[PDB]
Coordinates of C-alpha atoms and ligand atoms in Angstrom, one line a residue:
X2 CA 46.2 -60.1 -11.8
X3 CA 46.6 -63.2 -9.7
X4 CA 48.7 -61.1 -7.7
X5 CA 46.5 -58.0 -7.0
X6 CA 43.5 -57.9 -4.9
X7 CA 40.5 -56.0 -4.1
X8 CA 38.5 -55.8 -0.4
X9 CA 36.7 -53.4 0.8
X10 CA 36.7 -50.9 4.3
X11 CA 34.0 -48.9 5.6
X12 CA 35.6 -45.6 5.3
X13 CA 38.9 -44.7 3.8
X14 CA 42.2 -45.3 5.5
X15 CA 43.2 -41.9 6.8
X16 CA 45.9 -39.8 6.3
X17 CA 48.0 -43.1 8.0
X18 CA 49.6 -40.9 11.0
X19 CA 51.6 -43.7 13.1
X20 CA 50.6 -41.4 16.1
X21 CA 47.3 -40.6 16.0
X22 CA 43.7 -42.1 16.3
X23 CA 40.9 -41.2 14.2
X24 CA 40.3 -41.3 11.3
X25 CA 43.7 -43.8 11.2
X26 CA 42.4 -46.8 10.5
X27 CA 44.7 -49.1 12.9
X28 CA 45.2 -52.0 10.5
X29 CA 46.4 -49.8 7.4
X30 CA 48.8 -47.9 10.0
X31 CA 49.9 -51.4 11.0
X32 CA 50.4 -52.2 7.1
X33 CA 52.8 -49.2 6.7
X34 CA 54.6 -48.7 10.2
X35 CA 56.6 -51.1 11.9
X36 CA 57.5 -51.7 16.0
X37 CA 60.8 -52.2 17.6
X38 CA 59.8 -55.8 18.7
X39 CA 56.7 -57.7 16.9
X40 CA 53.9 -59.7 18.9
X41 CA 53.1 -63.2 18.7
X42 CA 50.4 -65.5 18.9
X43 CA 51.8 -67.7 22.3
X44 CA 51.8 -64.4 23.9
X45 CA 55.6 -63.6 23.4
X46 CA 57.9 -60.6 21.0
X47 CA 60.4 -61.1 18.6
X48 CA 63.2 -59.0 17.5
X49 CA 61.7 -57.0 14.6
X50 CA 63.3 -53.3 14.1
X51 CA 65.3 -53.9 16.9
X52 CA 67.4 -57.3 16.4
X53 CA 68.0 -57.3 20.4
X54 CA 67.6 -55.4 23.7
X55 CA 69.3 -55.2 27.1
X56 CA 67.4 -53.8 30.7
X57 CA 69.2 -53.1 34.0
X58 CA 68.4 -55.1 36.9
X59 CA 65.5 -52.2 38.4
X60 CA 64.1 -52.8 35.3
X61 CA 63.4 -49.2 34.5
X62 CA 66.7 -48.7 31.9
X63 CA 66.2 -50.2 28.2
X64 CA 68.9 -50.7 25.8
X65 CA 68.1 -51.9 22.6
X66 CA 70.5 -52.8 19.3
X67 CA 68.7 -51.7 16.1
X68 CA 68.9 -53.5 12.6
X69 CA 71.5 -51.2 10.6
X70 CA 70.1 -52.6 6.9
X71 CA 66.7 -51.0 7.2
X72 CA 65.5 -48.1 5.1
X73 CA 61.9 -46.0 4.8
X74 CA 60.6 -46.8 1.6
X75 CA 61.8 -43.4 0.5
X76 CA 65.1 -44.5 0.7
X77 CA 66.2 -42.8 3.8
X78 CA 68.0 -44.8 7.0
X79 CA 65.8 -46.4 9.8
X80 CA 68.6 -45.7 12.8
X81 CA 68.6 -45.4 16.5
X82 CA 68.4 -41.0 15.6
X83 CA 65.1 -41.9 13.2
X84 CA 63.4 -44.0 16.4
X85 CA 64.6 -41.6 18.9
X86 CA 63.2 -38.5 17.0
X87 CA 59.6 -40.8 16.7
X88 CA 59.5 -41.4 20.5
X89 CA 59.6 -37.5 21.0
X90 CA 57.4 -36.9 18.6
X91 CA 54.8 -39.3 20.5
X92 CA 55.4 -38.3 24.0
X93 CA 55.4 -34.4 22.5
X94 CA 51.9 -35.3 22.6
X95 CA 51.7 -37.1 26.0
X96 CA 48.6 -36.0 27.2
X97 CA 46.7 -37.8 24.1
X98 CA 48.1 -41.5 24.7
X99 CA 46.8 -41.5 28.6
X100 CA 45.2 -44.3 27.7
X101 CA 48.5 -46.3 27.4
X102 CA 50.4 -46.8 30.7
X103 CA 53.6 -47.1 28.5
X104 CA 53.3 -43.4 27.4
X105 CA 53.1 -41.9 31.2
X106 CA 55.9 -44.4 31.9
X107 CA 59.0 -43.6 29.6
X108 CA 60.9 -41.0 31.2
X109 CA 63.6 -39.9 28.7
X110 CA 64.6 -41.7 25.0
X111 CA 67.7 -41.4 23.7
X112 CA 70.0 -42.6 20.8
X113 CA 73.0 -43.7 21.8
X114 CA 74.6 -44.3 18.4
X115 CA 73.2 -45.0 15.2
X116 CA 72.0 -48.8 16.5
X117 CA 71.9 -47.9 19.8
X118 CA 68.6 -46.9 21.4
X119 CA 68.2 -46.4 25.1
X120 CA 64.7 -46.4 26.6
X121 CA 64.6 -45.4 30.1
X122 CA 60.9 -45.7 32.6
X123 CA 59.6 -44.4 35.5
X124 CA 59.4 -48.2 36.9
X125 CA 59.6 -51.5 36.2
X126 CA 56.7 -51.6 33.8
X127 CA 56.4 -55.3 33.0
X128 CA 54.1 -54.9 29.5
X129 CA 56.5 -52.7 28.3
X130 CA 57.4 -54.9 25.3
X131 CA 53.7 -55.5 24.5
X132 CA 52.9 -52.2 24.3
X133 CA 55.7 -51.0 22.0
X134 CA 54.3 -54.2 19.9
X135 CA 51.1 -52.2 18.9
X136 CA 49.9 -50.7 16.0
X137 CA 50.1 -47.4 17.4
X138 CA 51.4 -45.0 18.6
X139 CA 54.9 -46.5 19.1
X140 CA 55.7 -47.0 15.3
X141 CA 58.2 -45.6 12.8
X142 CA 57.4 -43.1 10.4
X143 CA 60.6 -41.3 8.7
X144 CA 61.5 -37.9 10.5
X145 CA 62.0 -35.9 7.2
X146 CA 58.5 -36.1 6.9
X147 CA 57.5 -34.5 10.2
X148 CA 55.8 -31.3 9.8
X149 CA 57.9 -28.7 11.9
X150 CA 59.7 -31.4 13.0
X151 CA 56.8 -32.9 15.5
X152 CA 54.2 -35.6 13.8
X153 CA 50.8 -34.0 16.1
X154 CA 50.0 -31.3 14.1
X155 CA 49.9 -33.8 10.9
X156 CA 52.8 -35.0 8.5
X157 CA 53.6 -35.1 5.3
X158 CA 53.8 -38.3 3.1
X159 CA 53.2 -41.5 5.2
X160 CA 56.7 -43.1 4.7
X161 CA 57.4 -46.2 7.3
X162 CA 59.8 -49.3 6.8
X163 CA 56.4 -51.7 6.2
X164 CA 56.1 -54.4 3.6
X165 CA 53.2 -52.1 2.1
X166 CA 53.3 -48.5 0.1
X167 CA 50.3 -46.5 0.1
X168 CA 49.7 -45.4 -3.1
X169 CA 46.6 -43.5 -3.4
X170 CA 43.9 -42.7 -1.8
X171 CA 40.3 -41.4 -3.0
X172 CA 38.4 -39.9 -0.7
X173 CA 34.9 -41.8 -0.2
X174 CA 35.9 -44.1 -2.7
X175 CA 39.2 -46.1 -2.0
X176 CA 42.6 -46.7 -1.2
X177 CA 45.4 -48.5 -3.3
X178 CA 48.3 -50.3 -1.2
X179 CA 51.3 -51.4 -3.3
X180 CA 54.3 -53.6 -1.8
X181 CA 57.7 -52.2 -1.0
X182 CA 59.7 -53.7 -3.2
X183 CA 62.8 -52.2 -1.1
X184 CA 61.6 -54.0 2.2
X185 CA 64.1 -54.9 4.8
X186 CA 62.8 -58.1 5.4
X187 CA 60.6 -61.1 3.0
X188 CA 58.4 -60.1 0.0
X189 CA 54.7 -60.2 0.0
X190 CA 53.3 -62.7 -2.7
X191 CA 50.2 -59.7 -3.4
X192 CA 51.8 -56.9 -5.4
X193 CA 48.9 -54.5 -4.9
X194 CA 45.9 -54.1 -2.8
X195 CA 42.6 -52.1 -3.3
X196 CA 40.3 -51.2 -0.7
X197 CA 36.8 -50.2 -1.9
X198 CA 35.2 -48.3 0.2
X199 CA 31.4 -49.6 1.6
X200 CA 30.3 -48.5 4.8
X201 CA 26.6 -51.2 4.6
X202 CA 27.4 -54.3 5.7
X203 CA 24.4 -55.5 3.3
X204 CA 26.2 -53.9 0.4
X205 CA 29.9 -55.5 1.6
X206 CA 27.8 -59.0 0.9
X207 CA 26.4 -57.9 -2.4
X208 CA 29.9 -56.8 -3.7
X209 CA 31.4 -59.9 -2.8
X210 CA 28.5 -61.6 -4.9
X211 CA 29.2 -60.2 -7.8
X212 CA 32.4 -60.1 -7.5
X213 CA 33.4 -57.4 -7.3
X214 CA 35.8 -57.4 -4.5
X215 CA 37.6 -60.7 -3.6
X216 CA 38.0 -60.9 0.2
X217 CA 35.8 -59.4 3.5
X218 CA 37.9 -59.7 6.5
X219 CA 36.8 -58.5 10.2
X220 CA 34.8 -59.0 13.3
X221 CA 30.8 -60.1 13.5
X222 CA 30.0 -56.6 12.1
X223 CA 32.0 -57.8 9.0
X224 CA 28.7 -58.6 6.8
X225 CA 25.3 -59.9 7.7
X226 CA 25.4 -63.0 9.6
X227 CA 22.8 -64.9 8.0
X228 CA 24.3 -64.3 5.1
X229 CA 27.7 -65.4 6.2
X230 CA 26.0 -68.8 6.8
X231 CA 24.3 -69.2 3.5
X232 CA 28.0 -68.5 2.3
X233 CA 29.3 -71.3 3.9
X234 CA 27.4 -73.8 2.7
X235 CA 28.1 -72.2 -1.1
X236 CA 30.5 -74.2 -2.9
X237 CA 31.8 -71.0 -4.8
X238 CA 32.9 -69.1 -2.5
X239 CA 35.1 -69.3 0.9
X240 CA 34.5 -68.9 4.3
X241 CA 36.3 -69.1 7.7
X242 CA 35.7 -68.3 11.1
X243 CA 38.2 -68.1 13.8
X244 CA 38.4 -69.1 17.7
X245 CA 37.5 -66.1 19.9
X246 CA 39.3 -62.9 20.2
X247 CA 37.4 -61.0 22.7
X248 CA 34.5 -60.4 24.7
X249 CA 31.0 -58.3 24.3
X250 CA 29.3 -57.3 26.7
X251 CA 27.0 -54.7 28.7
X252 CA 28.6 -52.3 31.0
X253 CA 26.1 -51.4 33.8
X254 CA 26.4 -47.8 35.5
X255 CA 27.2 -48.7 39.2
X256 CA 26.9 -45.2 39.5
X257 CA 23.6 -44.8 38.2
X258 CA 20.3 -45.6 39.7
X259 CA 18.9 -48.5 39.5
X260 CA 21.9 -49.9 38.3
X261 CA 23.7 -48.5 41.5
X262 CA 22.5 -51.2 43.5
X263 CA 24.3 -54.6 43.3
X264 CA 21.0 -57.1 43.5
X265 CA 19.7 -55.6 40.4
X266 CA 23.3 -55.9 38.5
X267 CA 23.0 -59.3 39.2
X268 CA 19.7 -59.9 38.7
X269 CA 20.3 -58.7 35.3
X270 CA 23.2 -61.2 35.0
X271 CA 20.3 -63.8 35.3
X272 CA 17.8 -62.4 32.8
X273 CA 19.2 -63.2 29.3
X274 CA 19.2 -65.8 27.8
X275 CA 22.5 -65.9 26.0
X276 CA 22.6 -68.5 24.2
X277 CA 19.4 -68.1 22.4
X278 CA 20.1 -64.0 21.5
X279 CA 23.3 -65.4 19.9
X280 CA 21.0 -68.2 18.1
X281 CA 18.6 -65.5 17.3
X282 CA 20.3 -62.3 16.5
X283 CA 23.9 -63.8 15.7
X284 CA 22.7 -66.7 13.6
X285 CA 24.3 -68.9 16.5
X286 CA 27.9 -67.4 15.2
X287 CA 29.5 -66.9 18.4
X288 CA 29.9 -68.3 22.0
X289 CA 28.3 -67.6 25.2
X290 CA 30.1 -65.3 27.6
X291 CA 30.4 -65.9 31.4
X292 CA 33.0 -63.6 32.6
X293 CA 34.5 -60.2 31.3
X294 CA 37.5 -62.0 30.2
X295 CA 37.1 -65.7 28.4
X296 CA 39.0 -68.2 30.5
X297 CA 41.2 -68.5 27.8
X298 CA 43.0 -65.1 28.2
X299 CA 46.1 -65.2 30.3
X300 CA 45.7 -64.4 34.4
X301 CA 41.7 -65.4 34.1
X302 CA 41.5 -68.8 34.2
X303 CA 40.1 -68.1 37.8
X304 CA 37.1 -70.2 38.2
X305 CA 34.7 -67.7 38.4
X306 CA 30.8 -68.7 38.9
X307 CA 29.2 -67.9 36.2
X308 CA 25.5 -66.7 36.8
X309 CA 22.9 -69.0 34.2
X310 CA 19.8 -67.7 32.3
X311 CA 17.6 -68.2 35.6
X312 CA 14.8 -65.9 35.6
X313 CA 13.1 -67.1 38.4
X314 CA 15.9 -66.1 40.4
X315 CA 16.6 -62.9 39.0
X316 CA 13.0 -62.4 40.3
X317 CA 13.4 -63.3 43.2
X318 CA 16.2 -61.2 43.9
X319 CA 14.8 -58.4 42.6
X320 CA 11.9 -59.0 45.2
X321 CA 14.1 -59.6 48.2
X322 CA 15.4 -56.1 47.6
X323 CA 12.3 -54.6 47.3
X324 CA 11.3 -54.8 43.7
X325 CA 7.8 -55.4 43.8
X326 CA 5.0 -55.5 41.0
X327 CA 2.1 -53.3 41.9
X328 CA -1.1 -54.5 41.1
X329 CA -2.1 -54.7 37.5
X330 CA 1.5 -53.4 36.3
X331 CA 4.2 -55.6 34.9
X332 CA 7.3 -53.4 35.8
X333 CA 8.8 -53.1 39.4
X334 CA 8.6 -50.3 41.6
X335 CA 10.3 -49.6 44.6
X336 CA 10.2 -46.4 47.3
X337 CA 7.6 -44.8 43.8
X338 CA 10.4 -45.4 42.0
X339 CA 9.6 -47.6 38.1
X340 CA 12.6 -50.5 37.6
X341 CA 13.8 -48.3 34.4
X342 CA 16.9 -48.7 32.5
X343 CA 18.1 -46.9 29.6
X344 CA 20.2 -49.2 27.0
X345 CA 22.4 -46.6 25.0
X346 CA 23.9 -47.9 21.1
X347 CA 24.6 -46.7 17.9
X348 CA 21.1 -46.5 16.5
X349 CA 22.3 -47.4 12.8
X350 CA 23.8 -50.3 13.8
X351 CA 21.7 -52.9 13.2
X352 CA 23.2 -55.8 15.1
X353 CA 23.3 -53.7 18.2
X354 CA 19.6 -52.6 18.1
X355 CA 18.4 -56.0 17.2
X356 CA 20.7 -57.6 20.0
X357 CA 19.5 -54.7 22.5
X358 CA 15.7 -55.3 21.7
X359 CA 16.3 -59.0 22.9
X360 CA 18.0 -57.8 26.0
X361 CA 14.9 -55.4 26.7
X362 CA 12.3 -58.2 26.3
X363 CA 14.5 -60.7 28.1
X364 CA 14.4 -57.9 30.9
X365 CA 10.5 -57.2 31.2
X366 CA 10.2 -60.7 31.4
X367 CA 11.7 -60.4 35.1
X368 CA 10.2 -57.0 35.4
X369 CA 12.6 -54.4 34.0
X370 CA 11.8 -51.6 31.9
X371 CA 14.2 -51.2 29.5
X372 CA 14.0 -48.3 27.6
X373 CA 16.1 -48.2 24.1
X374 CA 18.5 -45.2 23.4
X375 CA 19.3 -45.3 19.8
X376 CA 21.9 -42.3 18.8
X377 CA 24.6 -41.2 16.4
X378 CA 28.5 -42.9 17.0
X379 CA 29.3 -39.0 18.6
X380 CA 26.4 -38.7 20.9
X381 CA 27.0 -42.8 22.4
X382 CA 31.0 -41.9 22.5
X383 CA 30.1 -39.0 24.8
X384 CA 28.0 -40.8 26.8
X385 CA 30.7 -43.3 27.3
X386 CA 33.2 -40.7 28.4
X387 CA 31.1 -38.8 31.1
X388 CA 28.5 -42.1 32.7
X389 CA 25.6 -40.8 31.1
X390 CA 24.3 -44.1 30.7
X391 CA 22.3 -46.8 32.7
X392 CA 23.5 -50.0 30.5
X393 CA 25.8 -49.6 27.3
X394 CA 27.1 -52.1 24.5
X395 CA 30.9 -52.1 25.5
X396 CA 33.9 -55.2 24.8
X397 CA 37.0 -55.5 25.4
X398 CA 40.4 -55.7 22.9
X399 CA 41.8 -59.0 22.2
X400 CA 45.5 -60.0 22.1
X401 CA 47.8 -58.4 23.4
X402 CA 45.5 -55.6 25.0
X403 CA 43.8 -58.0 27.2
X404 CA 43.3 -58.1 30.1
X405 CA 46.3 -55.3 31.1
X406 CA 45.6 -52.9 28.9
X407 CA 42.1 -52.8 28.9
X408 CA 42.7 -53.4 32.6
X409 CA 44.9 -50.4 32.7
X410 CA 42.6 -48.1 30.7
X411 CA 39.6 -48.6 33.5
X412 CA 41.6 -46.1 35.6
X413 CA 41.2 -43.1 33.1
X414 CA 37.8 -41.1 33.6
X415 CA 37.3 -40.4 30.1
X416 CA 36.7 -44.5 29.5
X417 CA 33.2 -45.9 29.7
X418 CA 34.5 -48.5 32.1
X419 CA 35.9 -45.8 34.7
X420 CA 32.5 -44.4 34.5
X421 CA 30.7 -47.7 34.9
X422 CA 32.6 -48.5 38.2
X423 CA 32.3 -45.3 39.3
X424 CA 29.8 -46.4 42.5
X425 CA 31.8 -48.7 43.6
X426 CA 33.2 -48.5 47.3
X427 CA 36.0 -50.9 46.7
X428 CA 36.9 -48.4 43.3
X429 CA 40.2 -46.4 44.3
X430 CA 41.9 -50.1 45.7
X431 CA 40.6 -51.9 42.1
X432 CA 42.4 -48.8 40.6
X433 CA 45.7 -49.1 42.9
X434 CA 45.6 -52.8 42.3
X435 CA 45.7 -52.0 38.7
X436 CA 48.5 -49.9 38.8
X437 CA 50.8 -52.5 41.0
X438 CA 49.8 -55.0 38.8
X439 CA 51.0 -53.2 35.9
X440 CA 54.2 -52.9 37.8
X441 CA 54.9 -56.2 39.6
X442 CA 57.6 -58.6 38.6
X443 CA 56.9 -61.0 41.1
X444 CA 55.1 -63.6 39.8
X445 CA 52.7 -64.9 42.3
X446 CA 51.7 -61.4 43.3
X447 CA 51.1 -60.4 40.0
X448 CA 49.1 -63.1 39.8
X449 CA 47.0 -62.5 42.9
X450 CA 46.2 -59.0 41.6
X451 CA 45.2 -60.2 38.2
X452 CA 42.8 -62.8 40.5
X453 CA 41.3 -60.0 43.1
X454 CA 40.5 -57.4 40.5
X455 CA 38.9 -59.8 38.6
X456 CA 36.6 -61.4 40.6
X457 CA 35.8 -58.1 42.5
X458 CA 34.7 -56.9 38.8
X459 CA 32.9 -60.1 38.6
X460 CA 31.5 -60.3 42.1
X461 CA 30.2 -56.5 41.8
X462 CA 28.2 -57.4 38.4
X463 CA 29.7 -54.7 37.2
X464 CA 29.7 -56.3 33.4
X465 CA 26.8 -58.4 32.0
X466 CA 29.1 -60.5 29.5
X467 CA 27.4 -61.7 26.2
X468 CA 29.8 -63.7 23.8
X469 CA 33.4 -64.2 22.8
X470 CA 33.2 -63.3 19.2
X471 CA 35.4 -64.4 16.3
X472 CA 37.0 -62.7 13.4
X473 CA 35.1 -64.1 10.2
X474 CA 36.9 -64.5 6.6
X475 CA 34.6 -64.7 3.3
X476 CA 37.2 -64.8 0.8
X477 CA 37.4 -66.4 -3.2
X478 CA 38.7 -69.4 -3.5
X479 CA 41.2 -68.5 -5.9
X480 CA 43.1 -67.0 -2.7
X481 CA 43.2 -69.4 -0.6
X482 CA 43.6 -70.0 3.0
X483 CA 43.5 -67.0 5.0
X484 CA 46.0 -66.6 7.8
X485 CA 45.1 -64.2 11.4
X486 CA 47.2 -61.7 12.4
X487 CA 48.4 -62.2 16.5
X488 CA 47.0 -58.6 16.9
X489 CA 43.5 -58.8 16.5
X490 CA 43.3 -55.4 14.8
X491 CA 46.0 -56.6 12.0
X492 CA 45.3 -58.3 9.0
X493 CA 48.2 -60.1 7.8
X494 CA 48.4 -59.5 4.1
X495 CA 51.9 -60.4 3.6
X496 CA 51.2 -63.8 4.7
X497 CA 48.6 -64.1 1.9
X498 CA 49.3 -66.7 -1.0
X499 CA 46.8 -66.6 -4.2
Ligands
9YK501 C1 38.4 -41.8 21.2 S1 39.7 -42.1 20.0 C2 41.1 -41.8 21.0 C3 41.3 -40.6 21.6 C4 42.4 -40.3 22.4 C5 43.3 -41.3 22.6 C6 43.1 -42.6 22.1 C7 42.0 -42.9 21.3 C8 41.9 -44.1 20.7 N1 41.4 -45.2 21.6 C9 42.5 -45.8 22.4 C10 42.3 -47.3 22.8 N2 42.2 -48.2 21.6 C11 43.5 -48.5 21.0 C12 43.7 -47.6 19.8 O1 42.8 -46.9 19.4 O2 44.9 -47.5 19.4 C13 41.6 -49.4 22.1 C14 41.3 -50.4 21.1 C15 41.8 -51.6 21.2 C16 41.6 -52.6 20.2 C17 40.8 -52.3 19.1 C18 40.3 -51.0 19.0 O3 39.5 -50.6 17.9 C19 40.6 -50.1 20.0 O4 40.0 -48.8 19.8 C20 40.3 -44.8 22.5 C21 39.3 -46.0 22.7 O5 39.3 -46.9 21.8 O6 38.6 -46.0 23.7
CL502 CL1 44.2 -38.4 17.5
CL503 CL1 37.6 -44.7 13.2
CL504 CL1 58.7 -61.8 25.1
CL505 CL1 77.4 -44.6 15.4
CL506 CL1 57.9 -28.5 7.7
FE507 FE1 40.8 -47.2 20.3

């Protein structure tokens, strides 16, 4: 057992670096490693490995006091040396965590004494806090098992202060978790967790069936949505499905004809019927998106006119621009030129392609031609990274990522949303807006900045928004209720109770 249980994961957890990317699998990282201060759902940190913390009144100098009972689960001492040693180890690696404002920001990391860690920046960076909250990379591992005493060429055993041991791991198969039973802080009820590996979503449903694994636990790619449904209605098994964590939605290449010219971004914007491709290729699972960010998240409650399914006047824009249909044709020309957009996705994923074939007939019904780019996960990723797309599926990150992060992360031209906004005139103040944003500690401005990047995002049609997803549960009774993590990316076994 009653207190062992068996999910499943696409592919196996990785070798569990705390400082990498792929193949880490962020949730198992977050299952092992631990942060100096620990998100929370209103928004907030706690103390976690670090039971307090000081800053001077610029803002750019951090001290914080460390817990002195905490040990790696080899046995060795989590101290201020141990956390020091981690931050060089990260920042050794700089270039890599671009992404993450925090790691261009900390200027120097020092321990002070063995519970004194001193944190210095380059300015007064106000997500600091936030960002040393997530999974990775600013988590512990223990230093003895650096390799050559840095972490980015690889380490050796994945040792962290976490509730959770991994035990084993079989390539292609699965990976065993086990609980510390020398954690620092309270005892998981589940003694040992298996993850079988099952890359078809199809097959995640038929193991849960049979019973062969006892809880499915992710996004709306988790299993197939129609069968999520019939699940709910069955009195054997469990189901849940949470309030929204983040937004899907098209990024449309400003810099990129056609998509370079504003009328047809939001003449797209008026094209799909939303609700009815969530009814029809989501099983009506998920809400309507209006905006980039659901009004919801905090800094984008900002009133924001949404634009309707209204094809008549997508048309007519369309027209007004000089979009015409030539005699006898059903897609638009202009100056010779065919209304053509390429939709890039992964072409194995099946709820992107049946999601993107909606979107193409939604489209010729105003006049587009939409033309369907189906490739392998490498081939979309590098598309993403240099704009060699016209329209791609894209979403943001949930809590605590949005909107600053993911905000933040627009200004680095290896990101799919640097590249989207790429033709934009007003591009180099969005991305100096960003960064003062990032920076601001009055209130009101930051405020203001949060409210003009936004709507110019919005007003540009840069994003053609398509729901606010939820993270879905399928789970055996016999388990229970199933808690969410704050972090959208976490799954909180520890606060599971059979
Ligand atoms: C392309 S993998 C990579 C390479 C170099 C540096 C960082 C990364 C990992 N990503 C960094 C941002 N990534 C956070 C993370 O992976 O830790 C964003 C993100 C946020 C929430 C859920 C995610 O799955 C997710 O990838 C790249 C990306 O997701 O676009
Ligand atoms: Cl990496
Ligand atoms: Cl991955
Ligand atoms: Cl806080
Ligand atoms: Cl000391
Ligand atoms: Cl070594
Ligand atoms: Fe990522």
């Amino acid at each position: 057992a009653p207190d062992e249980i068996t999910t499943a994961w696409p592919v196996n957890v990785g070798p569990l670096n705390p400082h990498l990317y792929t193949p880490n699998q962020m949730f198992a990282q977050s299952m092992v490693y631990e942060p100096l201060v620990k998100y929370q759902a209103d928004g907030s940190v706690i103390p976690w490995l670090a039971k307090s913390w000081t800053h001077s009144e610029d803002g750019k100098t951090w001290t914080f006091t460390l817990r002195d009972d905490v040990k790696f689960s080899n046995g060795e001492p989590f101290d201020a040396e141990a956390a020091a040693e981690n931050f060089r180890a990260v920042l050794d690696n700089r270039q890599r965590h671009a992404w993450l404002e925090l790691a261009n920001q900390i200027v120097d990391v020092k321990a002070l004494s063995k519970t004194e860690l001193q944190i210095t920046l380059k300015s007064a960076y106000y997500p600091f806090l936030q960002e040393l909250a997530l999974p990775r990379p600013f988590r512990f591992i223990a230093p003895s098992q650096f390799k050559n005493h840095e972490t980015m060429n690889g380490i050796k055993a994945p040792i962290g202060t976490g509730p959770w041991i991994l035990q084993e791991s079989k390539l292609n198969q699965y990976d065993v978790f086990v609980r510390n039973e020398n954690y620092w802080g309270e005892k998981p009820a589940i003694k040992k967790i298996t993850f079988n590996v099952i890359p078809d979503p199809t097959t995640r449903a038929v193991a849960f069936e049979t019973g062969d694994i006892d809880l499915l636990y992710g996004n709306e790619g988790l299993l197939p949505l129609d069968t999520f449904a019939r699940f709910s209605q069955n009195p054997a098994y469990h189901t849940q499905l949470s309030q929204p964590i983040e937004t899907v939605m098209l990024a449309l290449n400003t810099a990129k004809a056609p998509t370079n010219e504003l009328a047809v971004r939001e003449a797209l914007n008026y094209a799909v019927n939303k609700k009815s491709l969530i009814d029809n290729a989501l099983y009506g699972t998920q809400q309507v998106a209006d905006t980039l960010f659901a009004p919801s998240v905090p800094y984008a409650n900002l009133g924001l006119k949404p634009s309707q399914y209204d094809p008549q006047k997508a048309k007519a824009l369309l027209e007004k621009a000089g979009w015409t249909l030539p005699a006898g044709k059903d897609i638009r020309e202009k100056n010779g030129q065919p209304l053509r957009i390429e939709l890039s996705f992964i072409g194995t994923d099946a709820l992107s392609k049946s999601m993107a074939e909606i979107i193409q007939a939604d489209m010729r019904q105003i006049g587009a031609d939409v033309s369907l780019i189906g490739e392998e996960e490498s081939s979309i990723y590098a598309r993403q990274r240099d704009g060699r797309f016209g329209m791609i599926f894209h979403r943001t990150w949930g809590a605590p990522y949005d909107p600053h992060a993911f905000l933040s992360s627009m200004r680095v031209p290896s990101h799919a949303d640097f590249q989207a906004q790429q033709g934009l005139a007003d591009k180099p103040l969005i991305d100096k807006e960003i960064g003062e944003v990032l920076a601001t500690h009055d209130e009101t401005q930051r405020q203001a900045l949060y409210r003009d990047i936004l709507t110019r995002l919005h007003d540009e049609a840069v994003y053609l928004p398509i729901s606010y997803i939820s993270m879905m549960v399928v789970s055996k009774p016999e388990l229970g209720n199933i808690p969410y993590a704050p972090i959208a990316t976490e799954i909180p076994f520890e606060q599971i109770k059979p």
